[PDB]
Each structure stands twice: as C-alpha cells, then as structure tokens.
Amino acid sequence: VPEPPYAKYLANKSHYCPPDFHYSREIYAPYGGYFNDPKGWRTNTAIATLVMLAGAYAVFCFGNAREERLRAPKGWIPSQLWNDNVPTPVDYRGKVL
Amino acid sequence: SSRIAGDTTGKYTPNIFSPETPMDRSFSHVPKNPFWEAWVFRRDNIQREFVWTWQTIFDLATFVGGLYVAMYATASFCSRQNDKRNGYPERNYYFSDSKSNFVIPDEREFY
Amino acid sequence: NYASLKADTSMDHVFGDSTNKLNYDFQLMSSKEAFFWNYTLYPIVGFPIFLYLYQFNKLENFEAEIAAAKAAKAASE
Amino acid sequence: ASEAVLRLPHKLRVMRMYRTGLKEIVNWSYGRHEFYPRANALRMEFEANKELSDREQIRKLVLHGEDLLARFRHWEPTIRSEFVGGTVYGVWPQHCKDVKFVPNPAYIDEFKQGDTVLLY
Amino acid sequence: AGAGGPVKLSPPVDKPLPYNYDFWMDNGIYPGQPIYDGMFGSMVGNMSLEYMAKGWLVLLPILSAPFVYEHCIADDVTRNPFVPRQYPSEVREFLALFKNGFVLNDYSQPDYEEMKRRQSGLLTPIY
Amino acid sequence: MFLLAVYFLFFSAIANGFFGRYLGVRGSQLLGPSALFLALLCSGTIFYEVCIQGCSTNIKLFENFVYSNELNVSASFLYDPLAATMTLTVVWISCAVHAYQNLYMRGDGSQTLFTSYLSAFTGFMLILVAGQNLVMLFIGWEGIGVCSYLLIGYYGSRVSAVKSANKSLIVNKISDGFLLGSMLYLWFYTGSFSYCSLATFQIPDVVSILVLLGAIGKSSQLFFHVWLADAMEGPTPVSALIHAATLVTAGIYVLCKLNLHSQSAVGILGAATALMGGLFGLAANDLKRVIAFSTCSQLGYMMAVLSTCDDGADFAMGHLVSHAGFKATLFLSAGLSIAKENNNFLNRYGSRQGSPTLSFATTIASLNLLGFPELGGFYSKESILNNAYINQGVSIILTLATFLTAFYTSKVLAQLYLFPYGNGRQQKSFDIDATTLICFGLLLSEMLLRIFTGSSLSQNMTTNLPAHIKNLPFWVALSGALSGLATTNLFSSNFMRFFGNRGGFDVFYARKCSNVFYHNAYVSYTLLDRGFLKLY
Amino acid sequence: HGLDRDTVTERVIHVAKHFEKVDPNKITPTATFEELGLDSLDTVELVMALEEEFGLEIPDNEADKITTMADAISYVVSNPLAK
Amino acid sequence: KIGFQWEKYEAWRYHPLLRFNKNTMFPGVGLGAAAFAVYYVVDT
Amino acid sequence: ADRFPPPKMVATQEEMDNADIPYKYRDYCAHLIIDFKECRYGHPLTWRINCAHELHHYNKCSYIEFKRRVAIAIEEKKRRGLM
Ligand SMILES: CCCCCCCCCCCCCCCCCC(=O)O[C@@H](COC(=O)CCCCCCCCCCCCCCC)COP(=O)(O)OCC[N+](C)(C)C
Ligand SMILES: CCCCCCCCCCCCCCCCCCCC(=O)O[C@H](COC(=O)CCCCCCCCCCCCCC)COP(=O)(O)OCCN
Ligand SMILES: CCCCCCCCCCCCCCCCCCCC(=O)O[C@H](COC(=O)CCCCCCCCCCCCCC)COP(=O)(O)OCCN
Ligand SMILES: CCCCCCCCCCCC(=O)SCCNC(=O)CCNC(=O)[C@H](O)C(C)(C)COP(=O)(O)O
C-alpha cells in the first residue's frame, strides 16, 4: 500500500532493528521507539550525565548537612575528608585516636 | 480512500461531501462481534434468568447471611472485650438487653 | 461493520488446526461443595479471631474461678 | 485416549500411539544418548504384536498401550521454543500492516469536542 | 529470532458464548488459557487432585517423623547432652527476658519454671 | 554520600524510562551501567564505614511523612551493619546485571524501559534495606513488588507471562497484608515505628505469626512458593535479580532485622521448604526452573538456621549474601546458554566449543551451590548445618536436602557440559562482548572476595562437635554428586510425577480455592445484586 | 525464512537414505513411501526425523497426511519456521 | 536392526569441536596447582 | 552446677561496651572475643591468615566452657536419677 504522506516525517528503521520485524512507526512512547538510536544521541547522553552529576552534588550537600554520626567510629573513616561532624575515633580498647 | 481530517494550522473543515473517507475519531473504533454483543446483553440482563430455588436460597443464606452473622458475632465479642479492657460497665447496645444505662464514657470520670 | 467471523487458516499447518475444543462446561462449583469449602477456608482466614476468643475465654474462666475461691475463703474467714 | 484419537482409524491410531510413545521417550530421557536404545525397544514392542489378527486381543493391546501412554505423560513436554507451548512463542509477535491511525486528533473540531445532553 | 516470530491467531467467536466465558483468557493468539491453569481443561501430567493428595498422604508421615520426636517425645533434659550457654548473672538475667531466647531452657537454673512459663507466653495481647 | 547510591539508581530509572527517546538504546547502555558503577563506589564506601569501622549513620530526609494525631512517621535512612552489607551485595549484583542486559536485551524492543525498570528495582531494594522505620521498609517492599509485576509480565503478548505477574502480585499482596497487621500491632504497643523503640523482649504470638506469614511471601516458603517457579516467564536479567537479592531475601532480612520470630515455626517451615525445593528441582527439565527450586532450598536453609542458635540471624545473613553471588552467576550463565542454544530444556544441551570464562563461572557457582570445600558457599552452609545438629529434626531434613541439592546440581553440570551435544544441526550463535566478560568478572571477584573476607564473624568459631559429625555434610554432598553424575534413578515414577507437579499446591488452589472464590463472586453478584435485588 | 525447494529436497532425500531397507536409487523427489518400501511405523520415524532435520514441530494431523516424498517436501517448503 | 538408523543419522555429534575440553571448564586450575606446589616447597 | 563453678570474668562491663560486644557474646569468653574482634576488623581481608592465634584462643576457652556445660548436664541428670 502506498505509504501515507506523513511517512517522510517519520524516521527509518534503525541498525539494531531486525529486518523482518515490522512495527508501526507512528506510535509515540516516552521510553523510546522499538529500536531508537536517534541522531544526536551522544549530545543527549552528555547532557544527561551533566544533570546527573549536578544532582549528585546537590544530594551530597543535603546528605552531608543531614548525616548524623552519634557514635565514634572505631577507626578512621573516609567521611572525615568531606564532613566535619564525625566524632573522633575510639578503638575497641577505648583509646582515642 | 482516506484523508486526514485534522489540521494543526486551525484551517480545519469537515468534508461531508468528500469522496475519500476522513480519518476522524471513528477510524480507530473497534469492529465488534455479534456473539460478544449478545453475551454482553445476556450478562447484564441476568435477572431474567433468576429463579427462586432451594439451592439458590441455600447459597444466598449460607454465604451472605452467614457472613453477616459471623461479622456481627465477632463485633459483639470485640465490644465485650473492649468494655472489659477499658473498665467500663457493660454498655447498653441496641439488641443487647442490659439493665445498665452506660452508653458514652464521661471524659471527666476516671475509669 | 461487524468483524468477520471467518478465521485465518494460513498458520494451521505450522501450529495445528483449531478443530480440538475445550471440554469444560463453563459451570461453577456445586452448592454443597461450596458450603463445605467456604465454611472451611473462611475460618482459616479468621485465625486471629479464634485466638482472641480462646484467650478471652481462658482469662474470664480463670478470673471467675479465682472469684469463687475468694468467696469461699472470705465466707469461712 | 481422547475423543479425537478414538475417532481415528485403526492404522492411524497405532501410528498415533507410536508417535506419542517416541515423544514421551524424548521427554523422559536425560539426553539424546538414552533415546536410541529406548526407541529401538519401542520399535520391537510394536513389531511384536503387528501380525496378530484376533480383533479382541488387538483391542486389548491398543487400550492398554493407550492407558500406559496416558499415565506417562510428562509434566514438562520438550517443545521447540518458536512453536505453541514454547518460550519464545509470542514474545514479540510480528505486527501486521493496515493499522487505523488518526492523525492530528486534537485538531479535529477542537472547540466543540465533548459530550452533549440531547433532549426531547 | 526473538522479534518478528510467526504466531497463530485465535479464531473469532462463531457460536453463542457461555455465561462464564470470563474464565477463559484469550489475547488473540491461538493457545488461549484458563484464568488459573488447572482450574479446568487439560491437567499437567494427567494428574488429578486425588493423586496429589494420596502422594502427600504418603509423604507427610516420613517428613514429620524427624520433627515429632524432638518437639514432642524429647524433653529439655534429654534433648541435648549439654545445658544452654552459661552467662554471668547480669547477662543471663537480661537474656532470659527474651521469650524467643535460648537460655530459657536451662534446667540447671533455679528459675527454670518461671522461664518455661515465660517461653509459653500470651497468645494475644490482654489489653 | 550515603544518599548518593539511591539517587544514582533512581536517576537511571527516570532518565531511561522518561527521556529514553533522546538517550536511545546506546544512551541506556551507557547511563545505566555508569550510574550503577558510581553507586557501587558509594556502596563500597558505606560498607567500609559501617561494617568494618563500626560507624552507623542516620539521614532524615524530611519529617512528618504521615502526621495524623499521635501517628507520626518520618522518611529517615539508617545505615546499620546489616544494611551496609545488603546494600553492597545488591548494588554489586545489579551493576553486573546492567552490564549483562546491554547485549542480552539488544534484540528486545524496549531496552531503555527494561533498564529503567531494573534501576528503579534496585533503588526500591535499597530503600527497603536502609529504612530506619517500618514504613520506609513497607515502601521498599511494595516498590519491589510492583517492579517485579512490571518485569515478569514484560512480554505482554504471552498469556503465561501476564498470569505469572498476576500470581506474584496477589501472593505478595496477601503477605504484605499480614505485615501491615504486624506493623500496626508494633506501633500500638511500643509507641513508634522505628526499630530502636520497636524492641520487645516478650511479644504475643499473634504478632509473631503475622510477621512470619508476611515474611514467607517474598522469601518464598511453603504454601507461598507458587509464584517463584512461574516467575521464569520474565527475561533472564529479571530472574537473576529477583532470585539472587531483591525479592527472595527481603523476608529473611525482615526476620533478622526484628527478632520476633518463634523457633518452632521457622525451623520446621524452613526445613520443609528446603526438602521440598530440592525434591522439586530433581524433576524439573528447564535449566531456569531447577535454579529457582534451588533458590527455594537455600531460602529454606536460611529460615531454618534462625531456630538453631543466637548467631542464627548472623548465619542466615551470611548465607544470604554468599548465595546472592553464585545464584546470580548461575542465572546469567543459564541465560547465555539459552541464547546460544535457542533452547530451555536440559536434554538438548551438550558439549560445544564456547567461552572459557562462562563455563568456569558456571562450574564455580555450581561448586558453591554443592558445598565444595574451601569455598564461600561451603562455609556459609556448614555454619548452618553444623549448628543445626542440636535441633535433631531440622538437621536430618537439611542433610537430606544437601544430598538432593548435590544430585541435581551435578546432573545439571553433566547435562550442560559433560553430556554429548543434544541440540540440532542448525546455525545458532550468541557472541559475547567484553561487557558480558566484565559482568562475569565482577561476579567472580565477588565470589573470590567472599572467601578471604568471610560471611559472619562466628563463621570459623568452633562448634564443639565430633569430627564425623562435623564433616558429614561433605560426604552427603559427595554422594549426591556421584549419584547425579551417574544419572541414576532415585524415586519411582509416581513420586517423580508428584515432584514434577511441584506437590500439587497450584492444582489444589485451582480446584478448590479459586472455584470457591468465583462462587462467592457468583452469589454476591448474579444471585443477589443483579438477581434478587434487580427489577424486571 | 522461506527455504527453497532444491535444498529441502536434498535434505529430505538425505534423511530418507538412512532406512536400511530403502535402496539408495529408489528415493526420488516424487516417490511415495510404499514404493520405497517403508511401512506405517517406519513413516512415523521418517516424519520425526524430518522434524529434527528442519527443526520444526509437525502437528499430528498434518503428520498423517505425509505419505509421499513429494508432499513432505511441500509441507517443509510451506512452513516459514523451517530451518 | 529394523527402524530408522538414528545413531548413523546423528553421527555428526562426535565432531571434534562438539566434544568436551577440560580447559574450557577448568581454565587455569593447573597454573594454580603449580603455584601452590612452589609455595608449598617455599613454606615447608 | 554447684560442683562445676563458673570461671572468673576477666572482661568488665565498660570494656565489653567499648568493644561493642553483643550480650550474646558475653559468656566468660568475652575478653578473647574482644581480641578476635579487634584483630578481625583490623585486617579486613587477611584476617583468616593473620588472625589465627586469637581465634585459636577463643575456640580453646569455648571448648573448656562447653566441657563445663556437659559436666553440669551430667551432674543434673544423675541428680534427677535419669542416670
Ligand atoms: C522513592 C523516591 C523516588 C521515586 C522514583 C520512582 C522510580 C520511577 C518512578 C516513575 C513514576 C512511577 C510510575 C510510572 C508510571 C507507571 C507505569 C509504568 O511504570 O510503566 C508503564 C510504561 O512505562 C513508562 O512509560 C514510564 C516508566 C518510567 C520509569 C518507571 C520506573 C518503574 C516504576 C516504579 C514503580 C512505582 C512505585 C510505586 C509503588 C511504590 C507501563 O509499562 P508496562 O505495563 O510494563 O508495558 C510496557 C510495554 N512492554 C510490554 C514492552 C513492557
Ligand atoms: C437466614 C440467613 C442466615 C442463615 C445462615 C446463617 C448461618 C451462619 C451461622 C454461623 C455464622 C458463623 C458463626 C458466628 C455465629 C456463632 C453463633 C453466635 C453466638 C456467638 O456469638 O458465639 C460466639 C461466636 O464466636 C464468634 O465471635 C464468631 C466466630 C466466627 C467468626 C469467624 C469465622 C468466619 C471468619 C470470616 C470473617 C468474618 C468475620 C470478620 C470479622 C462466641 O461466643 P462468645 O464468647 O463471644 O459469647 C457470646 C455469647 N453468645
Ligand atoms: C510439608 C507440610 C505440608 C505440605 C502440604 C501438605 C498438604 C497435605 C494435605 C493432603 C493430605 C490429606 C488429603 C485429604 C485426604 C483426601 C484423600 C483422597 C482425596 C480425594 O478423594 O478428594 C480430593 C479432595 O482434595 C483434597 O484432598 C484437598 C485436601 C487438602 C487439604 C488442604 C491442605 C492444603 C493442601 C495444599 C497442598 C496439597 C495438594 C494436594 C491436596 C480430590 O478432590 P476432587 O477434585 O477429585 O473432587 C471432585 C470434584 N467434585
Ligand atoms: C515413556 C514411556 C513410553 C510408553 C510406551 C507405551 C506404548 C505401548 C506400546 C505397546 C502397545 C502396542 O503394542 S499397540 C499394537 C496393536 N496391535 C495391532 O494393531 C495388530 C494389527 N497390526 C496392524 O494392523 C499393522 O501391522 C500396524 C501395526 C497397524 C501397522 O501397519 P503397517 O503394516 O502398514 O506398518
């Protein structure tokens, strides 16, 4: 059947799409199409990574503000590098470090 | 044999005289089956086939009335236990015949 | 209008014919069997109810027996 | 035996028994190596009674073999994945053409879309 | 090939439908199924419920035999050749509080009776 | 720092499932594994801080999540030693599965949505594990339940898959109803939902039974194990996650977090589940189903060990974390085997040239399952078996379960590798990329590290037992393995058929419970409201 | 994949050779099983062996209709899942 | 022998590349054993 | 019980709390389990090789305590007349 005019606006079958598999190309889904691989995907992934790291920075600030250690660690912990509310370590015998 | 009815530009006109069938909202309507329609009609009008039989009375009583009786008995037992728990006098419930007038506890009183 | 009632026979040779039908009568459990299984499973569902009933009866019986022995001890004495 | 097997003629009924027996040998085996001796044994079991002409004895053998094949039906049939009863049957079924898609749906009579209360 | 495999389409209904046809689940592919497999139709392995009940009747006595001896026949003194773990008094008194503890079975202790009655505690809250 | 891992997983879920159109299939194949790798670094930091250095942390995100009169609950995360260990194990396995799905799911349409489901699935597991109060645990519990529902039924055009998802949903609904009852009991008589004030030395039996009934759901025990076998309908990456860490372990984690269980019930139920799971795995002919029944058996061991001793909770958790590794490896290798052979049945597998890494991973995971000495699984299983000697009934059943486990494990190994080729003469192939090799390297590193670091503090603590008693599990496992290699017949055809039907638990439900359910529906609707109470 | 007749013919002829009774020149692209010397129980084994050769499952009612070398090739050609 | 010659029809299953290799299932066990032997000599 | 008296408790309450020893581990062996705990968490991955002396000492004291438990069991059982 002669493909409808809007078929030009619709995108092609991707490389990952099996040649036998047929799907309706007009259907829109937020998670993507049947095999995706859009043009410009690399820039979108870079933007997504930037947003991920910025949100990680915000979450890191929030958690550090709300991270409460009420019992001294037995030894040195990595959190001492970035958070100043860590109690001074005391070992199993009881000696302060 | 088909044409696009909708126009995003806003210049939409319904071609009631068009030789080609418009791709309107009815384009995607489900075709439907004769026997499925009669099954739907039968299932909705199931009161026509209702017959009072001893088996029907047995089922209705044993499940519906049985569940009501069980729930009422359980609720009465829970009320009795709560009255013993709270220290209240036995409460005058509607179908319980009690010679006490205690219904609502006094907040001011210590029980 | 209505959907076609004619089936597609293209894949019968690959996946088998549709001649074989279900043997179910599409009828429900008998009333007698249903009574037994409702009055068996529903109590199993309400297992806390019977535990509470058992303990409450035990508590009340022990309390009443204590009261009776107390009456006996407070009558003579 | 099912009704469809019973309605079959004698020749085809014995053929069905042999086919089902071979498939159940495949299902109850642990490997292809077990299959061959057991397949030869089933071969000999059918060949032993092929020359009988007494109808009543033949009916007895067919009925007993049908009961045996009914009891030893495997809980887990070994079926190729792409066929009915297989794992990959219907995973992503190929979607057919001629699909009814309505373009620009919200722009068909946009102002007047809604339900109306018609009265006499 | 995972995607694009051929499928058989279930035939359209051509006869009056039973009232309880909702017990049949059909998505349009040929092998339709009951709502719960085993409710009706073909049985896996051609085994009925009676067969499974008889098999369970055979199994249960053998499976229950190890458990019944220790739980019922055996007693705390004869269950094991040793007494429960011995603790200092301060630790033992706290550990004996736990109804699900393991020091409640110490028959050497002079509080054995009270500990056993604690272990067999209340079924439901009194209040 | 502690919050970061959950953020990374939920970001992966949102990014892949809502903006996957922009990211693409490749975009998922980067953002998923990278985010879970970052979460793995964060989880490693958490594990070092909390477990090794004994530094628990509490993070309160916000207060008054529910504030109605006295009822008050807050969204808070407490990373205690149990939580750090489960978090590390879960994130490690989930990063591995995300590496695995890049090549396995390439032939699937919605790979981005699959990655998004996997990442939210891990995130809800970490919410369950790290919650400081019962409500956060319930949130994670229901989140993993719904994610399992959306992952098992991924193939919607298969009636079996959607019915399996419905089965999982309904069974889990019953279980969390019992848990919600126990939660309400504990709030009423303790004053709080937090685990700190949750402590009760004496608890009435009803609360214990409700807790146990809720736990036996996700940790599929007897009468609640029906969903686990049917959960095979989903894609292989789903099966690995659900059986290794997320779903099955949650009940054991709940039982260990709150020690309100009763010794008599847990030991009997666990031993029965272990024996029944081994017996069911004997009959099975799908590769994937045998491993699920083995998961059931291992869950039975872990539940049984709680009854034995005070250290039973530690032993159960150690076996939990050890089991996640080799079980996840077993599912991933089985899934690769299915893809390479286009087959699910053990009969048609056979010797064929392949990758040395995958065969070695399968061999080592199966050896850990069997109990091969000086392995991570060996120690975590002997810690249970040796300490269960005091409970005579439990110990016997667990030893027979060890025999059965050895038998079917060795049978599966012989059928996959030692047996001659059983599949047909057709072009079948699945070439493995470096990403799958990194996945199996991560699993093998987990297995190797488990030996050096151990599972429990009292793992090598002496159980004062005679030598012939202590080394008995090895002999039983060896005898089971030798009998499995010979592929001998152990039971009569009647009992083999009985085990193939998994005890007929589902057929009983079909014939009695479901029919009564729909007869109650018939009485309620047809006879009464559309019958007696409907006008002509 | 629609497999061409020439290959299907070669593979069905290859399978048919393994019966000892059948003489290697009697099997032709168009020959009934009776002229080859095959019995009914033998035809069962040949239909099954065709099932391994082309990696397909023959539903039984069609399996009865296969009695000739010709129609077996036709059935294999018809099948889109034949390998 | 009467019947289809099943084993002759499937004689390709003994292909050199369809046989079991100890190295594939146990890749570096020998190297570990040799290293343990050397370390045994050192430790003793 | 009286015949086989408890041993002296070397570990004190403040030491057990400072080592964060759970109450279940406070069983007349607590000092040795403090040693084993500190050495095990000192060596996160080499504790199996490095921490063997402390584990040996703990296992030895636990063995002695287990013998005391069995002796108490025998004394109680003979007192009741069961043997
Ligand atoms: C806890 C704090 C952080 C919260 C983050 C939650 C994680 C993501 C939450 C996103 C919103 C949750 C609800 C999303 C919509 C629910 C529908 C859905 O999830 O999937 C849709 C469609 O999916 C979407 O388009 C949106 C999903 C985006 C991300 C979803 C993550 C998983 C949902 C989390 C579960 C919600 C938890 C609720 C209970 C706590 C339908 O999927 P299927 O029925 O499986 O069919 C898909 C087609 N196929 C057959 C091929 C599989
Ligand atoms: C014509 C229509 C009617 C005809 C058919 C009716 C047939 C139904 C009859 C049986 C119904 C179930 C039994 C309940 C009634 C029992 C007899 C009532 C007398 C009674 O209250 O005894 C109490 C029953 O226990 C209890 O408290 C209730 C226990 C049973 C409830 C649990 C079993 C089902 C669970 C399913 C859930 C339903 C409840 C949900 C909350 C215990 O005596 P007492 O110590 O309380 O002293 C109270 C002094 N009489
Ligand atoms: C290891 C811990 C325990 C694991 C589970 C053990 C369960 C043991 C229960 C089975 C053993 C006792 C069975 C009762 C004796 C019946 C013996 C004959 C059976 C019989 O004649 O009728 C059957 C009734 O179903 C029945 O027998 C149903 C009774 C079952 C009671 C409910 C217990 C839960 C069972 C769940 C798993 C068991 C599956 C097998 C029962 C089949 O009935 P029909 O369909 O032919 O009727 C006709 C439809 N008009
Ligand atoms: C997993 C366990 C497997 C279960 C196996 C159980 C199977 C039971 C096997 C034993 C049952 C029998 O022998 S059933 C044997 C029934 N006996 C007869 O039918 C005698 C008459 N024979 C004939 O008419 C023809 O020779 C005919 C044979 C039809 C062929 O036709 P051809 O001359 O053209 O080849």
Tab-separated table of N, CA and C in Angstrom, chain D residues 32 80, chain F residues 337-338 340-345 347-350 352 420-426 428, chain G residues 52, chain H residues 10 12-13 18:
chain	number	residue	atom	x	y	z
D	32	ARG	N	20.118	-37.286	24.510
D	32	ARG	CA	19.887	-37.968	23.242
D	32	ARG	C	20.433	-39.391	23.267
D	80	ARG	N	9.944	-27.244	20.958
D	80	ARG	CA	10.769	-26.191	20.385
D	80	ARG	C	10.185	-24.822	20.710
F	337	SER	N	23.440	-19.502	28.013
F	337	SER	CA	23.329	-20.823	27.404
F	337	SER	C	22.055	-20.942	26.574
F	338	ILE	N	20.938	-20.435	27.097
F	338	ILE	CA	19.680	-20.475	26.353
F	338	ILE	C	19.803	-19.690	25.053
F	340	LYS	N	22.521	-19.035	23.323
F	340	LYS	CA	23.427	-19.694	22.390
F	340	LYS	C	22.799	-20.935	21.763
F	341	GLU	N	21.976	-21.666	22.516
F	341	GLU	CA	21.368	-22.895	22.022
F	341	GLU	C	19.931	-22.721	21.554
F	342	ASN	N	19.332	-21.547	21.763
F	342	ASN	CA	17.928	-21.303	21.421
F	342	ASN	C	17.017	-22.336	22.077
F	343	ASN	N	17.349	-22.727	23.304
F	343	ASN	CA	16.636	-23.816	23.951
F	343	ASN	C	16.628	-23.626	25.462
F	344	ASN	N	15.594	-24.174	26.103
F	344	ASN	CA	15.419	-24.105	27.546
F	344	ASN	C	15.445	-25.466	28.227
F	345	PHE	N	15.500	-26.559	27.472
F	345	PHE	CA	15.383	-27.898	28.032
F	345	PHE	C	16.750	-28.555	28.174
F	347	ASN	N	17.704	-31.595	28.181
F	347	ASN	CA	18.021	-32.777	27.387
F	347	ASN	C	18.886	-32.427	26.185
F	348	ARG	N	18.586	-31.314	25.525
F	348	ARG	CA	19.202	-30.974	24.254
F	348	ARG	C	20.458	-30.130	24.406
F	349	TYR	N	20.849	-29.796	25.630
F	349	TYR	CA	22.142	-29.173	25.856
F	349	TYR	C	23.238	-30.220	25.709
F	350	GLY	N	24.452	-29.749	25.458
F	350	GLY	CA	25.553	-30.680	25.308
F	350	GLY	C	26.870	-29.952	25.196
F	352	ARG	N	29.938	-28.253	23.688
F	352	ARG	CA	30.141	-27.440	22.500
F	352	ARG	C	31.216	-26.410	22.812
F	420	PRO	N	27.103	-35.393	25.669
F	420	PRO	CA	27.289	-35.099	24.245
F	420	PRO	C	26.257	-34.095	23.757
F	421	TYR	N	26.569	-33.474	22.622
F	421	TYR	CA	25.696	-32.444	22.078
F	421	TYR	C	24.318	-33.020	21.777
F	422	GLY	N	23.282	-32.309	22.213
F	422	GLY	CA	21.929	-32.811	22.085
F	422	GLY	C	21.029	-31.970	21.206
F	423	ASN	N	21.477	-30.770	20.849
F	423	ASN	CA	20.671	-29.906	20.004
F	423	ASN	C	20.872	-30.254	18.530
F	424	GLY	N	20.033	-29.650	17.686
F	424	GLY	CA	20.022	-29.963	16.275
F	424	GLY	C	21.160	-29.327	15.496
F	425	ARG	N	21.235	-29.704	14.219
F	425	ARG	CA	22.255	-29.200	13.297
F	425	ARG	C	21.743	-27.945	12.589
F	426	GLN	N	21.688	-26.852	13.345
F	426	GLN	CA	21.273	-25.564	12.806
F	426	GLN	C	22.235	-24.480	13.261
F	428	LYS	N	23.181	-21.652	15.155
F	428	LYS	CA	22.794	-20.978	16.380
F	428	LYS	C	24.049	-20.392	17.006
G	52	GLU	N	13.559	-33.426	13.270
G	52	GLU	CA	14.890	-32.954	13.677
G	52	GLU	C	15.619	-32.233	12.545
H	10	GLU	N	22.815	-39.290	13.158
H	10	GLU	CA	23.326	-38.281	14.073
H	10	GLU	C	24.778	-38.542	14.460
H	12	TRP	N	27.251	-36.929	13.422
H	12	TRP	CA	27.974	-35.666	13.417
H	12	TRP	C	28.119	-35.077	14.810
H	13	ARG	N	27.466	-35.668	15.810
H	13	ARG	CA	27.504	-35.166	17.176
H	13	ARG	C	28.822	-35.472	17.866
H	18	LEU	N	32.610	-30.415	18.978
H	18	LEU	CA	31.446	-30.665	19.818
H	18	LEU	C	31.771	-31.595	20.980
